[PDB]
Amino acid sequence: TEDVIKEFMQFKVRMEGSVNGHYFEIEGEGEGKPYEGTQTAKLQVTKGGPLPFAWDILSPQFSKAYVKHPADIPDYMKLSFPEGFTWERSMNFEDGGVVEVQQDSSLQDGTFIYKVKFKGVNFPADGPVMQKKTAGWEPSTEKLYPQDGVLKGEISHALKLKDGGHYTCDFKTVYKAKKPVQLPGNHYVDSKLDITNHNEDYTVVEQYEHAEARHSG
Ligand SMILES: [Cl-]
Ligand SMILES: [Cl-]
Ligand SMILES: [Cl-]
Ligand SMILES: [Zn+2]
Ligand SMILES: [Zn+2]
Ligand SMILES: [Zn+2]
């Protein structure tokens, strides 16, 4: 994939979303090293700001072309380019909050283009998302497996709380190449997403993610 996906690649992203009815839009840009599994993003809230809910529920929605894969695990997301792939995700939180996300990824004239639609509902008014009591995602491991002609991933995930406990969230994601490409077998991806900067009202935010694929255990 060295001809299509270079060792340095940039991306642009736009998200339209709502949380408990509150509409917003975010635009951003990012860059990274797809074969090393590292990337940065800078996001700006362009509508609906300042957001009255935790940034953290948005952060994993702003880039699977940048996961380091061993040679022996087919890198389905990289192989999908230039046409690209789509993903659809549910996030089911312990307190009944639920998010659904739909994303389209393409490569256009050397730059990745990401389009995201986000909808979160049923977050309790006094819960940690609406009260902005979260403090970032734990490091995670996604279990990936082929099924029904697509790649599926599950994470038993958790957000840290400012008080030091956790707020758990089950992720289910379906990744679909836009053309037929070789599916990998079962594997795991370790990710770590850090919010590295933000302004006081989270209308400008910087993120960094490191992600690497491997076999079980
Ligand atoms: Cl992956
Ligand atoms: Cl290996
Ligand atoms: Cl993959
Ligand atoms: Zn191996
Ligand atoms: Zn993979
Ligand atoms: Zn913990």
What report would you give on this structure?
- With 217 residues, this protein is mostly beta strands.
- It has one domain: Green Fluorescent Protein, CATH 2.40.155.
- The protein contains one helix and twelve strands.
- The chain has one helix spanning 76-79, and strands at residues 9-19, 22-33, 38-47, 85-93, 98-108, 111-121, 134-137, 140-147, 150-161, 166-177, 187-198, 204-214.
- The chain has an eleven-stranded mixed beta barrel.
- It is globular.
- The two termini are 28 Å apart.
- The structure holds chloride ion (3 copies) and zinc ion (3 copies).
- Residues 67, 69, 75-76, 144, 184, 187, 189, 213 line the site of one zinc ion.
